[PDB]
Design a protein around this motif. Structure first.
Motif, PDB file in Angstrom:
ATOM      1  N   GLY A  94      30.978 -47.208  66.797  1.00  0.00           N
ATOM      2  CA  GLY A  94      29.890 -47.968  66.287  1.00  0.00           C
ATOM      3  C   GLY A  94      30.225 -49.441  66.269  1.00  0.00           C
ATOM      4  N   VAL A  95      29.181 -50.269  66.148  1.00  0.00           N
ATOM      5  CA  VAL A  95      29.262 -51.703  65.999  1.00  0.00           C
ATOM      6  C   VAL A  95      28.439 -51.998  64.747  1.00  0.00           C
ATOM      7  CG1 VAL A  95      28.963 -53.960  67.114  1.00  0.00           C
ATOM      8  CG2 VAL A  95      29.144 -51.938  68.550  1.00  0.00           C
ATOM      9  N   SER A  96      29.099 -52.394  63.651  1.00  0.00           N
ATOM     10  CA  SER A  96      28.411 -52.599  62.358  1.00  0.00           C
ATOM     11  C   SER A  96      27.396 -53.741  62.529  1.00  0.00           C
ATOM     12  CB  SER A  96      29.437 -52.765  61.225  1.00  0.00           C
ATOM     13  OG  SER A  96      28.954 -53.545  60.139  1.00  0.00           O
ATOM     14  N   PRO A  97      26.136 -53.578  62.062  1.00  0.00           N
ATOM     15  CA  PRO A  97      25.118 -54.613  62.251  1.00  0.00           C
ATOM     16  C   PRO A  97      25.203 -55.730  61.198  1.00  0.00           C
ATOM     17  CG  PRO A  97      24.124 -52.723  61.163  1.00  0.00           C
ATOM     18  CD  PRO A  97      25.591 -52.391  61.387  1.00  0.00           C
ATOM     19  N   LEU A  98      24.544 -56.845  61.513  1.00  0.00           N
ATOM     20  CA  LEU A  98      24.519 -58.022  60.687  1.00  0.00           C
ATOM     21  C   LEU A  98      24.014 -57.597  59.320  1.00  0.00           C
ATOM     22  CD1 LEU A  98      24.564 -61.206  60.541  1.00  0.00           C
ATOM     23  CD2 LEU A  98      22.120 -61.069  60.966  1.00  0.00           C
ATOM     24  N   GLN A  99      24.617 -58.167  58.273  1.00  0.00           N
ATOM     25  CA  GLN A  99      24.186 -58.044  56.892  1.00  0.00           C
ATOM     26  C   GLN A  99      23.773 -59.434  56.414  1.00  0.00           C
ATOM     27  OE1 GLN A  99      27.399 -56.708  54.408  1.00  0.00           O
ATOM     28  NE2 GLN A  99      26.613 -54.629  54.321  1.00  0.00           N
ATOM     29  N   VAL A 100      22.516 -59.604  55.998  1.00  0.00           N
ATOM     30  CA  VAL A 100      22.067 -60.872  55.408  1.00  0.00           C
ATOM     31  C   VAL A 100      22.235 -60.723  53.899  1.00  0.00           C
ATOM     32  CG1 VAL A 100      20.278 -62.683  55.434  1.00  0.00           C
ATOM     33  CG2 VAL A 100      20.275 -60.952  57.243  1.00  0.00           C
ATOM     34  N   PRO A 101      23.212 -61.396  53.235  1.00  0.00           N
ATOM     35  CA  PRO A 101      23.257 -61.398  51.770  1.00  0.00           C
ATOM     36  C   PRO A 101      21.995 -62.056  51.183  1.00  0.00           C
ATOM     37  CG  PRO A 101      25.360 -62.169  52.689  1.00  0.00           C
ATOM     38  CD  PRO A 101      24.352 -62.123  53.823  1.00  0.00           C
ATOM     39  N   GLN A 102      21.747 -61.821  49.887  1.00  0.00           N
ATOM     40  CA  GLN A 102      20.708 -62.533  49.123  1.00  0.00           C
ATOM     41  C   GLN A 102      21.365 -63.734  48.425  1.00  0.00           C
ATOM     42  OE1 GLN A 102      18.567 -59.096  47.184  1.00  0.00           O
ATOM     43  NE2 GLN A 102      18.724 -58.449  49.319  1.00  0.00           N
ATOM     44  N   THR A 103      20.961 -64.949  48.834  1.00  0.00           N
ATOM     45  CA  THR A 103      21.616 -66.225  48.455  1.00  0.00           C
ATOM     46  C   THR A 103      20.656 -67.027  47.572  1.00  0.00           C
ATOM     47  OG1 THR A 103      20.831 -67.312  50.436  1.00  0.00           O
ATOM     48  CG2 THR A 103      23.052 -66.396  50.561  1.00  0.00           C
ATOM     49  N   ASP A 104      21.169 -68.067  46.901  1.00  0.00           N
ATOM     50  CA  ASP A 104      20.418 -68.746  45.839  1.00  0.00           C
ATOM     51  C   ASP A 104      19.418 -69.740  46.458  1.00  0.00           C
ATOM     52  OD1 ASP A 104      19.965 -68.668  43.096  1.00  0.00           O
ATOM     53  OD2 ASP A 104      21.495 -70.192  42.616  1.00  0.00           O
ATOM     54  N   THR A 105      18.224 -69.873  45.846  1.00  0.00           N
ATOM     55  CA  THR A 105      17.281 -71.010  46.109  1.00  0.00           C
ATOM     56  C   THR A 105      17.442 -72.041  44.981  1.00  0.00           C
ATOM     57  OG1 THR A 105      15.217 -70.203  45.036  1.00  0.00           O
ATOM     58  CG2 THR A 105      15.676 -69.408  47.256  1.00  0.00           C
ATOM     59  N   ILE A 106      16.723 -73.167  45.064  1.00  0.00           N
ATOM     60  CA  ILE A 106      16.811 -74.213  44.025  1.00  0.00           C
ATOM     61  C   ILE A 106      16.051 -73.749  42.779  1.00  0.00           C
ATOM     62  CG2 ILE A 106      16.480 -76.611  43.418  1.00  0.00           C
ATOM     63  CD1 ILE A 106      18.442 -76.130  45.807  1.00  0.00           C
ATOM     64  N   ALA A 107      14.795 -73.339  42.995  1.00  0.00           N
ATOM     65  CA  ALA A 107      13.949 -72.605  42.031  1.00  0.00           C
ATOM     66  C   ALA A 107      14.773 -71.829  40.985  1.00  0.00           C
ATOM     67  CB  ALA A 107      13.026 -71.679  42.792  1.00  0.00           C
ATOM     68  N   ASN A 108      15.726 -71.002  41.448  1.00  0.00           N
ATOM     69  CA  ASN A 108      16.432 -70.016  40.633  1.00  0.00           C
ATOM     70  C   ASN A 108      17.609 -70.684  39.917  1.00  0.00           C
ATOM     71  OD1 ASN A 108      15.244 -67.911  42.898  1.00  0.00           O
ATOM     72  ND2 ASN A 108      15.474 -66.998  40.856  1.00  0.00           N
ATOM     73  N   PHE A 109      18.430 -71.411  40.683  1.00  0.00           N
ATOM     74  CA  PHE A 109      19.576 -72.161  40.159  1.00  0.00           C
ATOM     75  C   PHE A 109      19.092 -73.062  39.016  1.00  0.00           C
ATOM     76  CE2 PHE A 109      23.936 -73.792  41.633  1.00  0.00           C
ATOM     77  CZ  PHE A 109      24.154 -74.604  40.546  1.00  0.00           C
ATOM     78  N   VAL A 110      17.945 -73.724  39.229  1.00  0.00           N
ATOM     79  CA  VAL A 110      17.328 -74.578  38.215  1.00  0.00           C
ATOM     80  C   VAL A 110      16.872 -73.697  37.039  1.00  0.00           C
ATOM     81  CG1 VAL A 110      15.032 -75.625  37.843  1.00  0.00           C
ATOM     82  CG2 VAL A 110      16.702 -76.822  39.261  1.00  0.00           C
ATOM     83  N   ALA A 111      16.161 -72.590  37.318  1.00  0.00           N
ATOM     84  CA  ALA A 111      15.654 -71.667  36.267  1.00  0.00           C
ATOM     85  C   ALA A 111      16.819 -71.096  35.436  1.00  0.00           C
ATOM     86  CB  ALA A 111      14.800 -70.563  36.866  1.00  0.00           C
ATOM     87  N   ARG A 112      18.000 -70.933  36.049  1.00  0.00           N
ATOM     88  CA  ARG A 112      19.205 -70.403  35.370  1.00  0.00           C
ATOM     89  C   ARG A 112      19.911 -71.465  34.511  1.00  0.00           C
ATOM     90  NH1 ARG A 112      20.067 -67.677  40.970  1.00  0.00           N
ATOM     91  NH2 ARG A 112      20.144 -65.449  40.438  1.00  0.00           N
ATOM     92  N   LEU A 113      19.849 -72.732  34.942  1.00  0.00           N
ATOM     93  CA  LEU A 113      20.544 -73.841  34.279  1.00  0.00           C
ATOM     94  C   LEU A 113      19.674 -74.431  33.157  1.00  0.00           C
ATOM     95  CD1 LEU A 113      23.056 -75.547  34.193  1.00  0.00           C
ATOM     96  CD2 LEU A 113      22.101 -77.001  35.987  1.00  0.00           C
ATOM     97  N   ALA A 114      18.346 -74.311  33.279  1.00  0.00           N
ATOM     98  CA  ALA A 114      17.414 -74.736  32.228  1.00  0.00           C
ATOM     99  C   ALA A 114      17.261 -73.632  31.172  1.00  0.00           C
ATOM    100  CB  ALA A 114      16.078 -75.108  32.820  1.00  0.00           C
ATOM    101  N   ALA A 115      17.601 -72.386  31.536  1.00  0.00           N
ATOM    102  CA  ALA A 115      17.589 -71.240  30.604  1.00  0.00           C
ATOM    103  C   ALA A 115      18.664 -71.418  29.533  1.00  0.00           C
ATOM    104  CB  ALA A 115      17.819 -69.943  31.337  1.00  0.00           C
ATOM    105  N   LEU A 116      19.909 -71.588  29.994  1.00  0.00           N
ATOM    106  CA  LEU A 116      21.082 -71.697  29.137  1.00  0.00           C
ATOM    107  C   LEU A 116      20.916 -72.888  28.169  1.00  0.00           C
ATOM    108  CD1 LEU A 116      23.956 -70.797  31.705  1.00  0.00           C
ATOM    109  CD2 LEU A 116      22.592 -69.317  30.204  1.00  0.00           C
ATOM    110  N   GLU A 117      20.700 -74.096  28.714  1.00  0.00           N
ATOM    111  CA  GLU A 117      20.597 -75.363  27.945  1.00  0.00           C
ATOM    112  C   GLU A 117      19.565 -75.251  26.813  1.00  0.00           C
ATOM    113  OE1 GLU A 117      20.377 -79.066  30.323  1.00  0.00           O
ATOM    114  OE2 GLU A 117      21.968 -78.204  31.621  1.00  0.00           O
TER     115      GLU A 117
END
Lengths: 53, 46
Positions: free
Chosen positions: B23-46
């Motif tokens: 076999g030849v293992s196929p490409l895996q696209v990870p799920q990576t961060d957008t700005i929307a979310n990084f911002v939503a996570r940093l405004a959550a904590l504060e």
């Protein structure tokens, strides 16, 4: 002495109500400008770092 | 005769390894961060 100090209070107070209104009309607008400008800046800085990443 | 039986078994060992290495293992696209979310996570904590 006391009738005077009494009236002086109400005048103070009233000026305190009348002033606190001026300032609450001429500030609410400016506060939303400043927050939007701040969020804009955070977003753009992050975008710059993402481009670098 | 036992030798002959054993070669059967070797043929088995060989089909196992070929299955293991195919076999030849196929490409895996990870799920990576957008700005929307990084911002939503940093405004959550504060």
């Amino acid at each position: 002495p006391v009738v005077i100090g009494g009236v002086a209070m109400m005048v103070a107070g009233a000026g305190g109500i009348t002033a606190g209104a001026i300032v609450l009309h001429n500030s609410l607008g400016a506060r939303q400008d400043l927050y939007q400008k701040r969020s804009s800046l955070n977003s753009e800085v992050l975008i710059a770092t993402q481009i670098g990443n | 005769t036992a030798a002959d039986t054993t070669v059967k078994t070797v043929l088995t060992d060989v089909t196992t390894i070929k299955a293991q290495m195919a076999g030849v293992s196929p490409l895996q696209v990870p799920q990576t961060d957008t700005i929307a979310n990084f911002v939503a996570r940093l405004a959550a904590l504060e």
